[PDB]
Motif scaffolding. Structure first.
Motif, short mmCIF file in Angstrom:
data_model
loop_
_atom_site.label_atom_id
_atom_site.label_comp_id
_atom_site.label_asym_id
_atom_site.label_seq_id
_atom_site.Cartn_x
_atom_site.Cartn_y
_atom_site.Cartn_z
N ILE A 152 0.69 -1.34 0.06
CA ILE A 152 -0.09 0.09 0.08
C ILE A 152 0.88 1.36 0.05
N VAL A 153 2.13 1.15 0.12
CA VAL A 153 3.18 2.38 0.19
C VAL A 153 3.02 3.05 -1.24
N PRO A 154 2.84 2.45 -2.15
CA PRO A 154 2.89 3.05 -3.73
C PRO A 154 1.57 4.14 -3.94
N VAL A 155 0.62 3.77 -3.27
CA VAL A 155 -0.55 4.80 -3.52
C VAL A 155 -0.59 5.80 -2.66
N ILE A 156 0.12 5.74 -1.41
CA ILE A 156 0.06 6.83 -0.67
C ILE A 156 1.35 7.78 -1.01
N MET A 157 2.52 6.94 -1.46
CA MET A 157 3.65 7.77 -2.06
C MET A 157 3.37 8.59 -3.49
N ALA A 158 2.48 7.78 -4.37
CA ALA A 158 1.94 8.49 -5.57
C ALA A 158 1.09 9.67 -5.29
N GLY A 164 2.23 5.53 -11.29
CA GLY A 164 0.90 4.49 -11.29
C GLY A 164 1.31 2.98 -11.71
N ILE A 165 1.82 3.14 -12.87
CA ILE A 165 2.52 1.93 -13.61
C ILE A 165 3.41 1.26 -13.12
N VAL A 166 4.60 2.14 -12.34
CA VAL A 166 5.75 1.54 -11.77
C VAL A 166 5.05 1.06 -10.45
N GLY A 167 3.92 1.70 -9.79
CA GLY A 167 3.28 1.01 -8.49
C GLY A 167 2.64 -0.09 -8.61
N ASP A 168 2.08 -0.29 -9.81
CA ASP A 168 1.10 -1.49 -10.14
C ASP A 168 2.02 -2.65 -10.39
N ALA A 169 3.15 -2.20 -11.30
CA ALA A 169 4.04 -3.42 -11.90
C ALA A 169 4.85 -3.77 -10.43
N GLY A 170 5.14 -2.73 -9.50
CA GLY A 170 5.73 -3.08 -8.57
C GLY A 170 5.10 -3.87 -7.60
N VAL A 171 3.79 -3.66 -7.32
CA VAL A 171 3.06 -4.33 -6.47
C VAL A 171 2.56 -5.75 -7.05
N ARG A 172 2.60 -5.92 -8.36
CA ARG A 172 2.23 -7.25 -8.99
C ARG A 172 3.44 -8.09 -9.03
N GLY A 173 4.75 -7.48 -9.04
CA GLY A 173 6.13 -8.14 -9.10
C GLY A 173 6.46 -8.49 -7.68
N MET A 208 11.33 -2.25 -5.86
CA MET A 208 9.94 -1.66 -6.25
C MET A 208 10.08 0.00 -5.53
N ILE A 209 10.53 -0.01 -4.26
CA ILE A 209 10.50 1.26 -3.42
C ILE A 209 11.66 2.29 -3.86
N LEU A 210 12.70 1.50 -4.17
CA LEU A 210 13.91 2.28 -4.72
C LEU A 210 13.65 2.69 -6.27
N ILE A 211 12.92 2.04 -7.13
CA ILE A 211 12.65 2.45 -8.33
C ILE A 211 11.25 3.54 -8.27
#
Lengths: 392, 150, 150
Positions: free
Chosen positions: B46-52, B101-110, B121-124
């Motif tokens: 859930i960190v990529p949505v709050i970071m985005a 968005g795509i980096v968070g979705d691909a980072g969450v799926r990966g 995924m957090i570094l990228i």
């Protein structure tokens, strides 16, 4: 929450020796820690300890634990299948058969008085004979209710086709719902009976052109026989030789022909099968209900005795000395099994060791994941002490 | 044209809010789709949505800072650097949110399959804010280099 | 003031009503589709539409505040900050609603089998109003900097 059953009374079975101490409240006994240290103070503690059952060596306990776990899983699947058949029969609610009284006694009062009492097992008998006879009697009691439910389902499936064939729609209809001789042929040597389904618009055209459509046909035979809301079904009497020409000529007129012949034995057997299918389905439903309840009570008692034997076997195998341990059945309400399992796992998890406990609380019962299974039969995680979950 | 510089103040928060909304939607779609397979790492995923979603604070703070120094009338000099800095900050926030968005979705799926990919995924995903920070710094320097207000 | 001064008042409520309508439709589709399999998530699905209505209420209050400051004549500088704040608030509300609807439908669809992501979907839905609050604050400052028309 969908990690456990919230439509029935849940129970947690725990066993420990007479020298254990909880890690959530120091300076307190396990008996006072069971009721007072419970989450919210609503946990009801009942007596569930049992004596020795002539347990042999340690090598036979490992072989007996697998048969006790398999017999407990088979009795739990048979009790859930009998309760699922009783709930599927449309005779009880979703909470009945899981929280209601058994033999005029409640589940907490009957579970608190469960002192290893049975009518076919004793304290001086072996656990293998009662464990095999309980799984055999539960398997036969589940198989009898399954065969009665299959016979009732076959009787309802035959009664549906008999009730649909008795009357209703003109798509599958047979002339057996009328015993009057004006709708068929009686004492004829060359005449037959054939039904023709016509629409409501072409009903007058089918009756006006039905006599001139096929030669050598009986006049005035076309009458109102049956139709639900869309068509009119009429009967036609003529020779057996012109039945194929009348049906082929009637098929070209946009009509729906129905093949049939004059016979009273077909209508008598067709009425007899639908006449007997409802009584067979009713008797199979009543015998399936009585055998389902009578097999469900003995299946629940055999499952409780199998869980009581497996809890004493796992508690005797896990702790060792002394041979007598204090085991009780805690009646927890629904939606609070995670706090009781986390408090009991964090309190009694240090008794088994320091590397066998885990910080994972709850379970996962999703359709796309079967991880975090709280049990000692999987490699994802294990239990830190003697504790089992019972979901009725 | 007096008061023509409001388009640069509104376009930065509009583009940053749209890019943060699209990045939060794209991160929440992959987080919600990846939460069914493994709900143990839901808090880590859930960190990529709050970071985005924090990318809108640069355009909102730039629009509030440009709105705090604006009066009722302005010259034509501020309405050229203001729309350029606001359009640059809005385009940088929209591109950073669109990549996040795509980096968070691909980072969450990966990261849903293997838990070791959360650091990658957090570094990228952490490097996507450099475009919005550079556009906010260029919009802050271009906004600070303006004058003749009124 | 030449013309096109009234468009900023309806430009916020148009995009906010479209975004709130699409988010309410996307939340009600997943709520009605997920209510057949599990009836436990029926009452939980009202948080996306009830929380989504506040973004339309903020755009309606900003449209009423911009409508009350219009009259029958526009100023020289009002018709740029008004359309900019209205377009920014409308794009922020439409992006917030469109980003909230897919996450609410995906979360409501994924939470049907086993409710574990309800705290994550409620956490993202609780934090998704930052774009509407930032656009409402920027529209409040831009509307406050454009008063006294005439």
């Amino acid at each position: 929450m969908a990690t456990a059953l919230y439509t029935a009374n849940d129970f947690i079975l725990i066993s420990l020796p007479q020298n254990a101490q909880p890690v959530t409240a120091p300076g307190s006994k396990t008996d006072s820690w069971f009721n007072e240290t419970l989450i919210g103070g609503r946990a009801f503690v009942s007596d569930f300890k049992i004596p020795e059952f002539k347990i042999g060596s340690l090598d036979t306990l490992i072989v007996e634990s697998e048969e006790l776990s398999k017999v407990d899983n088979q009795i739990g699947a048979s009790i859930g299948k009998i309760i699922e058949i009783l709930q599927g029969l449309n005779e009880t609610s979703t909470n009945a058969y899981r929280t209601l009284p058994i033999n005029n006694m409640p589940v907490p009062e009957y579970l608190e008085n469960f002192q290893w009492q049975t009518r076919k097992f004793k304290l001086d008998k072996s656990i293998k004979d009662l464990i095999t006879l309980i799984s055999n009697e539960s398997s036969q009691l589940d198989a009898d209710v399954r065969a009665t439910y299959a016979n009732y389902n076959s009787a309802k499936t035959n009664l549906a086709a008999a009730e649909r064939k008795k009357t209703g729609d003109l798509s599958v209809r047979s002339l057996h719902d009328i015993v009057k001789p004006e709708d068929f042929v009686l004492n004829s040597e060359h005449l037959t009976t054939v039904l023709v389904a016509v629409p409501k618009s072409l009903k007058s055209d089918f009756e006006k052109s039905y006599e001139t459509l096929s030669k050598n046909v009986v006049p005035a035979s076309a009458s109102v026989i049956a139709e639900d809301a869309e068509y009119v079904l009429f009967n036609v009497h003529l020779f057996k030789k012109n039945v194929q020409e009348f049906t082929t000529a009637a098929r070209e007129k946009k009509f729906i022909p129905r093949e049939f012949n004059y016979s009273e034995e077909l209508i008598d057997q067709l009425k007899k099968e639908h006449d007997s299918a409802a009584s067979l389905e009713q008797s199979l439903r009543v015998q399936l209900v009585r055998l389902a309840k009578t097999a469900y009570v003995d299946v629940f008692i055999n499952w409780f005795h199998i869980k009581a034997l497996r809890v004493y076997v796992e508690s005797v195998l896990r702790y060792g000395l002394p041979p007598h341990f204090n085991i009780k059945i805690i009646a927890v309400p629904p939606k609070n099994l995670s706090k009781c399992k986390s408090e009991l796992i964090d309190a009694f998890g240090f008794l088994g060791g320091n590397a066998f406990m885990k910080d994972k609380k709850g379970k996962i019962n999703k359709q796309d994941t079967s991880l975090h299974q709280y049990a000692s039969l999987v490699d994802t995680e294990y239990e830190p002490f003697v504790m089992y979950i019972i979901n009725l | 044209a007096p008061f023509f510089g409001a388009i640069g103040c509104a376009s930065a928060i509009i583009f940053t809010s749209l890019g943060a909304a699209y990045g939060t939607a794209k991160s929440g779609v992959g987080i919600c789709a990846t939460c069914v397979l493994r709900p143990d790492l839901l808090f880590k995923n859930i960190v990529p949505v709050i970071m985005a979603g924090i990318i809108a604070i640069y355009g909102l703070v730039v629009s509030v800072l440009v709105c705090y120094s604006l009066g009722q009338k302005q010259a034509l000099y501020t309405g050229f650097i203001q729309l350029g800095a606001g359009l640059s900050v809005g385009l940088s926030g929209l591109a950073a949110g669109f990549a996040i968005g795509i980096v968070g979705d691909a980072g969450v799926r990966g990261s849903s399959q293997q838990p070791r990919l959360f650091v990658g995924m957090i570094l990228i995903l952490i490097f996507a804010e450099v475009l919005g920070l550079y556009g906010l710094i260029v919009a802050l320097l271009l906004n600070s280099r303006a004058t003749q207000d009124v």
